[PDB]
Amino acid sequence: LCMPVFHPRFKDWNTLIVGKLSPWIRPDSKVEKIRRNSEAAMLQELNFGAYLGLPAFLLPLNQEDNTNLARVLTNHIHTGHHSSMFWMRVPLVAPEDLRYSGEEKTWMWWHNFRTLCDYSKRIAVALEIGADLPSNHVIDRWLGEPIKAAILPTSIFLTNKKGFPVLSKMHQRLIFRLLKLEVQFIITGTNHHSEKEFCSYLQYLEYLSQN
Amino acid sequence: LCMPVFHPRFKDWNTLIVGKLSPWIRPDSKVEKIRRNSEAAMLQELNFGAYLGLPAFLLPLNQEDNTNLARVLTNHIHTGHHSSMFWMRVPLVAPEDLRYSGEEKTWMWWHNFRTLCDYSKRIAVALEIGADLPSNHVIDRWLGEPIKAAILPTSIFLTNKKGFPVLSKMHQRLIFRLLKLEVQFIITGTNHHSEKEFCSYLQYLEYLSQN
């Protein structure tokens, strides 16, 4: 099962498909059996994605240790039948933090995995944005990394006087910094959201392009 | 809400997105009010599709008269903000027939609409296959038309001794005639179908490419 990415056609949107690893898959579960089941299921799904020619595949990392996830992935690349781009889904801020080990934690997560895959050009990041935002020294660090996309939940938009979704001022400054890299966009939480309502989130982001 | 088309990468699959008109939309309902509501909703959805850059849009025709559907569509093209390809979803055989007015009926449907849009190069057909198949004189007629895609329900596949989906011999001869035009494919009925099971339908079609 897949997911739609939206890439701004302004340098007018464009839409493409990326695959998503089933959520129950946890290659680094403390438990032995889950590791084996998950390592198996991950390859099933990576090859199904390559078979469909999906241009990228979304793999989540939300803990310190991802040795198992790195290995299965390196193995799958070696075969030669690969979607040829892998976007690691990483939170800008750790969710457990909100009810260098500080705000730079999730960066280390990525950086460590990045080095485990020998700085593979096939591996990039899909950054997940929350309500809390970290400092600028850590925002700077992330912007050196290869971000292909940004993941924005509907829950971080405010509604304005007129009743439409808009980004907080802090959040606006961040996003603008992301449309400078031409990233693609993913919007989560479209559940219970009419297709005419979901359209406005994109309208706003297109407006935000000129600010 | 959208739909995935699969285009064979052999001349190895490829996947793209086409939009689908909401089903409750019936621009030629006998009832007045539905016509007005549907004519309005159709344009909402066509423009949402153009805004996302969807390469094609699926519009169903399953009756004789489609004057309303042709007009709204011609109007939407004139604006200039259009997905730039429209695939009309037409049954090879009328479903009401199975519990020139004969087996050529659904062709006339298309041909009549085709002429209402002044043989617009933006308008093509997405042909829907059932269990019943019509003669060859009518199959010939259709193959002169511009078929961009073929719609195949899981329900028309047999299972073979080994327990996998395969096409009836009659159905195999038809499909082969369709992979000669390089059409794209759409598979309906993926409900209650594991992603590993759905993968086999495509495997079969890729095999069928060499027969």
């Binding site: 304005n160 007129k162 359209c199 407006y207 | -």
Partner: peptide, 14 residues
């Protein structure tokens, strides 16, 4: 998909 006046205005509240 037809933009209206004030669509993109800032939330004058949080």
């Amino acid at each position: 998909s037809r933009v209206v006046p004030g669509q993109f205005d800032d939330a004058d509240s949080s």
